[PDB]
Amino acid sequence: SHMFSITVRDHIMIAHSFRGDVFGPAQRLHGATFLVDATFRREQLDEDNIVVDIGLATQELGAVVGALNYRNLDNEPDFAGVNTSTEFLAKVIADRLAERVHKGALGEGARGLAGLTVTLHESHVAWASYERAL
Amino acid sequence: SHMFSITVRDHIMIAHSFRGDVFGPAQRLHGATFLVDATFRREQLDEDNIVVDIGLATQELGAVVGALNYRNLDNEPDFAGVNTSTEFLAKVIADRLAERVHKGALGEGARGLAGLTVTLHESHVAWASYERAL
Amino acid sequence: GSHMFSITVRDHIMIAHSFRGDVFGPAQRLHGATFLVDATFRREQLDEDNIVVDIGLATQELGAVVGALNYRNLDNEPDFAGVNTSTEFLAKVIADRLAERVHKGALGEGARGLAGLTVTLHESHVAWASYERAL
Amino acid sequence: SHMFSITVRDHIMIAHSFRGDVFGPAQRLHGATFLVDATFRREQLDEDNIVVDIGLATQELGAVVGALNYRNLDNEPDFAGVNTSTEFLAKVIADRLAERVHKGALGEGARGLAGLTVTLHESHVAWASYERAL
Amino acid sequence: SHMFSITVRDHIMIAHSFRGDVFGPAQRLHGATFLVDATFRREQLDEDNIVVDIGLATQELGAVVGALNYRNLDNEPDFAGVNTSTEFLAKVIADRLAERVHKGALGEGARGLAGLTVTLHESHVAWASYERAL
Amino acid sequence: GSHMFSITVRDHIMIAHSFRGDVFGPAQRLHGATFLVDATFRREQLDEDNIVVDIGLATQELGAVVGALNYRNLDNEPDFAGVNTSTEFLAKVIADRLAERVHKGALGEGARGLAGLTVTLHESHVAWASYERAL
Ligand SMILES: [Cl-]
Ligand SMILES: [Cl-]
Ligand SMILES: [Cl-]
Ligand code: NA
Ligand code: NA
C-alpha cells in the first residue's frame, strides 16, 4: 500500500493547571508553548498534484488554534472540569480541523483525505500526538 | 507485531513554479531547499545486525537526489507539464530508491526490506512524505 | 483503526562501541556516539487523569533503562557480547526493557492499557533509527 | 558591558544562479529556502520592558522579506549583475530593516536599538549572517 | 584575542500576562515554555581543561530556573508590577547565575569566567538573550 | 565596529574518549560522543565573488580536519596525551587546524582576508561549546 502526507506548523501559548496529585507541581496554574503540527494524509494526489492546498491548510489550522491562543484554558467553558493535557489538546485541534475538512474549508479535494494527525510539542523533550481517520 | 527502521538525511536545492490558481504566489518561479529523509524499514535485522548498509543507503540516496540538485525542475524533461510539489517529489525519490533496492544497489540484504518512506522538508513549517511497500 | 494517542519523551546517552564486518568501514574502529533516545507510548483512549501515561514515571523509567547504558563502552558489556550494537539494535533493547517495566506496573497501573511503544535513537543530525512494538 | 536582544524568524523561497567557476553546479539556475532570523539588540529595555514591539518586528520582517519571496532573483533589477549569495542577502535584508527602523516602522522606541543581525539558513548544514550597528 | 564557551539547556513552563497596548492579545493571561540556554565564557580553560564544571553548571541553572517553573509569574512577588518579557527574564536568570558564580557555587575555577549569556526561546520563531560580564 | 559577515558550515564526528579527574564522575569511564562541528568564518567585506569564503573549499577543509579525528578513541592519540578532550578543548583544536589551512591558502587566496573563525561543537541536544579566534 502507499500514502502521501503534508504537515504544516503553527503554535499557541496558553495557561492552565491540572487536577490530580499525580501532576505534582503542574497542579499550579502555569502555561506552555505548544508547537502545533497538522499532518494531512491521502492515498492519491489531487488534480493539482497535491495532498491539500497549503494556503487553506495553514489558514484553517490558524483559524482553529487562533481560538485557543493567548488564553487561560482553566477559564474556557469548552474545557470545564477537564485536564487540558498535551494529548487531549492534540485531539481537540484534530477534531476541529476534521470538521473544517468536512465542511469544505480545505477545498473539495480535501474531502478525499484519509486521515489527519495533530502533534503538539510542549518542550524540546516532550511531545504528544493524536491520529484519526477522516 | 514489530518493525525496525533507519533514516538518513540529504538535501537538494531547486527551482520550480506551479500551475493552478490554488497556488497563489507559488505560481511564480521560485525555489526550495528540500531536506530529504529516506527511511528504510524491515521486520528483522540482517546478518550484520542492521536494517541496511548505511554507506550504500547514503550513496544511493545521494545518487538519486544528485540528479535533481541545483536544477530548475520546470525545465526538467522528466517533469514536463507536472506540478513538482513536495509530496510529488517525495514519491519520485521513493520510487527511484525502490528501483535501486530491487536492482541490488543497497546490497542483497536490502531485498528483505518491508518498505520505505521519503520525507521532504521545504521549510521549518512545511514538509511532506510518501510511504510505500518495497 | 479510528484513532491513536501518543506521547514521547526524550533522554540521551553517550557511549563507545565498535562494529564487526567490512560493511562498517571506519566504524570497525572503536568510536562512540551520542544517542538521543525518544520513547513514544501510544494508546487508544486517555486514562482517568486524561493522559496517555504518567510522564513522571515515563521519564523516570526511561532514565533508569538508559542509565544502565550511559557512559559505557558497549563492547565490554556482557549483555551485548558478540553482537553489533547498531542504533536499530539498541532501539529494540531499550524498547523491550521499557516494555518489561510497563508489564511490572512501574509506569502505573494505567500503563497496562497502552497499545504499544516506539523507541527512536538519533546518532547524528543525519541518521536515526527506530523500533516499534506492541505492548 | 551588557546587551539585550530579541530574534524573530520568517522564511523565503527564491530562485537564482551564481556567476563564476567557483560556484560549480550552483552556476545553474536553481533555488533555495532561506530561514531568515532578524536579531534586534539594545543596551536597555524600553518603557514597556522590551527590546522592540515584537509584533511590529515580526510584521516588518514580513514586509521586508515579502518583497523577495517567491521570486527569481536573477530577474530583480536591484540585483542586476550581483551574486545573491546567502551572506549578501543577509546584508540586503539587514539594510532594509535598518531603513524601516529609521523611518519609525518598528515604533519610535526602536530608534534606541544599538544594532541588528540577520541570519539566513540555506540548509541544515549552511547558514550566513550579517551584523551591523544602527 | 580568543574566547571559550560552554552552553547548557534547561526549560521552564510559566504563565504570565503583559501590561501595555503594544502587547495586543498578550495582555491576556497566557503562558510559555522557555528553553533556557546558559552560556559561560572564559579566555583560558581551567586546570581540568574545561570552561566550567558542567555538573555544577546544570545543577545551578536548575536551581535558578526551578524557582520560576510551574508558576504564574504575575503573582510572583519578585516581579510585581513588571512585564516578564523573554528579554527581562533572560537578565533575571543571568544575574542570578552570576550571584551563584560569585559565591563559589560553580566551583572556585568559575570565578575566572569572563561573562555569561542567557537565551530564552519562547517558540520556534521567537527568542531573546541577555549578555553580561562577570 | 560597523559590520561583519559570516558563513557557517556543519560537519560531524563520532569518537570515543574518557576524562581524568573525579570532577567528571561517570565520564571518567571510556565512553563516546557525536559532535556536530560548526565552523564559522567571518569577514568585514565580501570577496570579489560576493562571498565570505569558497564554500566548497570550506567544507572540503573542514572535512579534512575532522576526518583525522573521526571514528577514533581520542585517548590513544599522542597529541592529546595528558589532556582532557572536552568539547571546548576540541573546538580549539579544530579551529587552530582550520586556521593553519586558511593561512596556507587552502581555502583560496581570498580567505587570507578573513577576520576570524569560530568553531562550535554540539555534544548533545542540551550541551555545546565554542572557541572563537582571530585569523
Ligand atoms: Cl479530565
Ligand atoms: Cl500536475
Ligand atoms: Cl514593566
Ligand atoms: Na491547583
Ligand atoms: Na473522504
Q: What is the 3-state secondary structure (H, E, C) of B7-66?
A: EEEEEEEEEECCCCHHHHHHHCCEEEEEEEEEEEEECCCCCCCCCCCHHHHHHHHHHHHH
Q: How far is the CA of C111 from the centre of ligand 1 (A)?
A: 17
- As a whole number of angstroms, the distance between CA D127 and CA F118 comes to 14
Q: What angle do CA A87, A89, A92 make, to 5 degrees?
A: 120
F33 to C34, C123, E52, E131, F128: CA distances (angstroms)? 5, 9, 19, 29, 12
Q: What angle do CA C23, C24, C25 make, to 5 degrees?
A: 95
> Near ion ligand 4, which residues have CB within 5 Å?
A 17, 27
Cα torsion angle, A43, A45, A51, A52, sign: negative
Which segments of F26-86 does DSSP mark as H helices, in order?
55-67
Nine-digit cell string for E103:
559565591
- As a whole number of angstroms, the distance between CA B34 and CA B11 comes to 5
- As a whole number of angstroms, the distance between CA A107 and CA E11 comes to 40
Element (H, E) at D31: strand D30-42
| Distance between start and end Cα atoms, chain C | 17
Nine-digit cell string for F110:
581570498
- As a whole number of angstroms, the distance between CA F40 and CA F4 comes to 12
- As a whole number of angstroms, the distance between CA D68 and CA D31 comes to 13
The answer to whether residues F122 and F36 touch, using CB atoms and an 8 Å cutoff, is yes
- As a whole number of angstroms, the distance between CA A21 and CA B35 comes to 43
For residue D19, the SS3 value is: coil
Cα dihedral: F103, F108, F113, F116 (round 10) = -60
Residues 73-132 of D with CB under 8 A from B: 122-125
**Contacts of residue A115, Cβ cutoff 8 Å, sequence gap at least 6:** A40, A41, A131, A132, A133, A134
Nearest chain C alpha carbon to F10? C125
- As a whole number of angstroms, the distance between CA A67 and CA A132 comes to 21
Residues 1-20 of F with CB under 8 A from D: 1-11
Nearest chain A alpha carbon to E67? A25
Question: How far out from the chain centre does Cα D81 lie?
Answer: 20
- As a whole number of angstroms, the distance between CA B105 and CA B112 comes to 13
Of the listed ligands, the closest to the CA of A83 is 1
- The DSSP call for residue C118 is E
Question: How far out from the chain centre does Cα C43 lie?
Answer: 17
Helices (H) and strands (E) in chain C, counts: 2, 4
The answer to whether residues A127 and C7 touch, using CB atoms and an 8 Å cutoff, is yes
- The DSSP call for residue A103 is T
- As a whole number of angstroms, the distance between CA C33 and CA F16 comes to 8
Q: What is the CA radius of gyration of chain A?
A: 16
From the CB of residue F69, how many other CB atoms can be counted at a distance below 10 Å? 20
Q: What is the DSSP string of A10-76?
A: EEEEEEE---SGGGGGGGSSEEEEEEEEEEEEESS--TTSSSS-HHHHHHHHHHHHHTTTT-BGGG-
* Cβ within 8 Å, pair B128-A7: yes
- As a whole number of angstroms, the distance between CA D97 and CA D101 comes to 6
- The DSSP call for residue F75 is G
- As a whole number of angstroms, the distance between CA D20 and CA F81 comes to 45
The answer to whether residues D73 and F50 touch, using CB atoms and an 8 Å cutoff, is no
Which of F129, F128, F103 lies closest to F114 in space, CA to CA?
Answer: F103
Region for C65 from its dihedrals, namely left if φ exceeds 0, alpha if ψ lies in -120 to 50, beta otherwise: alpha
φ/ψ of residue C71, rounded to 5: 55, 40
Q: How far is the CA of E32 from the centre of ligand 2 (A)?
A: 42
Q: How far is the CA of A111 from the centre of ligand 5 (A)?
A: 5
- As a whole number of angstroms, the distance between CA D60 and CA D6 comes to 14
Q: How far is the CA of F129 from the centre of ligand 3 (A)?
A: 34
Q: What angle do CA C81, C92, C94 make, to 5 degrees?
A: 85
How distant is the Cα of E19 from the closest Cα of chain F, in angstroms?
33
- As a whole number of angstroms, the distance between CA B90 and CA B34 comes to 10
The answer to whether residues E16 and E88 touch, using CB atoms and an 8 Å cutoff, is no
- As a whole number of angstroms, the distance between CA F55 and CA F7 comes to 9
- As a whole number of angstroms, the distance between CA D79 and CA D89 comes to 10
**Contacts of residue F104, Cβ cutoff 8 Å, sequence gap at least 6:** none
Q: How far is the CA of D102 from the centre of ligand 3 (A)?
A: 25
* Cβ within 8 Å, pair C4-A130: yes
For residue B119, the SS3 value is: strand
Resolution in Å equals 1.5
Determine the residue type at E131: E
From the CB of residue E134, how many other CB atoms can be counted at a distance below 10 Å? 17
- As a whole number of angstroms, the distance between CA F107 and CA F111 comes to 6
> Residue D32: beta bridge partners?
D14
**Contacts of residue B87, Cβ cutoff 8 Å, sequence gap at least 6:** A4, A5, A6, A45, A50, A51, B120, B128, B129, B130
- As a whole number of angstroms, the distance between CA F107 and CA F26 comes to 40
Would you call B69 an interface residue with chain C, using a CB distance cutoff of 8 Å?
Answer: no
Can you point out the beta strands (E) in chain F? 3-17, 31-43, 116-122, 127-134
For residue A126, the SS3 value is: strand
Q: How far is the CA of A68 from the centre of ligand 4 (A)?
A: 21
φ/ψ of residue C77, rounded to 5: -95, 120
Determine the residue type at E36: V
Interface test with F, best of E5, E40, E41 (most F CBs within 10 A): E5
Which of B8, B3, B26 lies closest to B84 in space, CA to CA?
Answer: B26
Q: What angle do CA E72, E77, E82 make, to 5 degrees?
A: 75
From the CB of residue F54, how many other CB atoms can be counted at a distance below 10 Å? 21
Of the listed ligands, the closest to the CA of A19 is 4
**Contacts of residue C22, Cβ cutoff 8 Å, sequence gap at least 6:** C28
Neighbours of chain D (3+ CB pairs under 8 A): B, E, F
- As a whole number of angstroms, the distance between CA C82 and CA A63 comes to 56
For domain D1-134, which architecture applies? Answer: 2-Layer Sandwich (3.30)
From the CB of residue C12, how many other CB atoms can be counted at a distance below 10 Å? 19
Element (H, E) at A129: strand A126-133
Element (H, E) at E119: strand E115-121
> Residue C8: beta bridge partners?
A127, C40
**Exposure on the CB side of residue B5, measured as CA atoms within 13 A:** 23
Would you call B45 an interface residue with chain C, using a CB distance cutoff of 8 Å?
Answer: yes
Experiment type = X-ray
The answer to whether residues C131 and B51 touch, using CB atoms and an 8 Å cutoff, is no
- The DSSP call for residue F73 is B
The answer to whether residues B6 and B40 touch, using CB atoms and an 8 Å cutoff, is yes
From the CB of residue E11, how many other CB atoms can be counted at a distance below 10 Å? 20
- As a whole number of angstroms, the distance between CA C127 and CA A85 comes to 31
How distant is the Cα of F126 from the closest Cα of chain D, in angstroms?
18
Nearest chain F alpha carbon to D126? F9
Question: How far out from the chain centre does Cα E19 lie?
Answer: 22
How distant is the Cα of B55 from the closest Cα of chain D, in angstroms?
19
A55 interaction partners in chain B (CB closer than 8 Å): 22-24
- As a whole number of angstroms, the distance between CA F95 and CA F101 comes to 10
Nine-digit cell string for F57:
573549499
Nine-digit cell string for F42:
567571518
F27 to A124, B126, C99, F93: CA distances (angstroms)? 24, 39, 28, 21
Question: Which of A32, A123, A125 is opposite residue E31, by nearest beta carbon?
Answer: A32
- As a whole number of angstroms, the distance between CA D54 and CA D59 comes to 8
Domain C1-135: give its CATH superfamily: 6-pyruvoyl tetrahydropterin synthase/QueD (3.30.479.10)
